[PDB]
Symmetry: C4
Subunit: 91 residues, 4 copies
């Protein structure tokens, strides 16, 4: 479960990294940063896609990607962090 969601998130982020570095001309690390803050809905206070292609892709990327990204964040903290902490509270 967590593994599959992990891989799916990675692929999704790889896709965004490639798209933004190519179409919007961002440095790979910046493309990844934008993909990440966009899908987690944090957003970026400085960059907004400048091309129409970038805008359309971002719209679609958002609708398809948020569900997944949060599904992963959900399991990451519940099935991977909840116990590691919950078990530690055990005297």
């Amino acid at each position: 479960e967590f593994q599959v969601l992990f891989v799916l998130t990675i692929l999704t982020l790889i896709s965004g990294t490639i798209f933004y570095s190519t179409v919007e001309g961002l440095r790979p690390i910046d493309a990844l940063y934008f993909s990440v803050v966009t899908l987690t809905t944090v957003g970026d206070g400085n960059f907004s896609p400048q091309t129409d292609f970038g805008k359309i892709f971002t719209i679609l990327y958002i609708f398809i990607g948020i569900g997944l990204v949060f599904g992963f964040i959900h399991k990451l903290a519940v099935n991977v962090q909840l116990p590691s902490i919950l078990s530690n509270l055990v005297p």
Copy 2:
């Protein structure tokens, strides 16, 4: 269900596209982009409505639109992407 939520989201976004392109003078594609990042709470790092009408509308648009948009994103990934992936994990 997914169909109704799909149509409802489209209508909501069409409404925003028309409003922002008319009152805030945004190019239609930019009006749609702003409507989308606003309702998914991603936000835009460059544009904020400049008119009081735009500000009041955005406030109302947000309260009425987020519930719907996330209800659609929820079903989109759960009733349309969960299986297409879950079924594929089947050896």
Copy 3:
């Protein structure tokens, strides 16, 4: 329920409107806009509190206000919009 959450949200937003217009010197409508996008996590791409008082308040305002605001948005679409639409789907 919806009424109480409605009033609670109004009071919370009134509080923010007063704070930002006074401490950060924003026009009342802008103070309200910032309070709204902040609590719904949409965020504003142009304004960030400039005073330390504004920053500390925003931090506290966020932790105390998001839970409420989303509790209201949740009931607004589920107990006030779900039926008005769900009932309409009835042939």
Copy 4:
């Protein structure tokens, strides 16, 4: 529960405050503000990490921190504010 989540959130925010004030050179209060709006997904409309180290950390900070921060906000309003209000509605 609320106590543990409280402490965990504090530690997480302390970590961000230290990181951003050191690597991105932000005033401690600004580092804390950025950590807070980032983890609650509100985002900041003016600042984005400028160093690659800052970008990578923010990406990881987000994935590890949102789950926790919202788990705390969830219990804060449900197990600490819901009653204080719900009980008051009692004639």
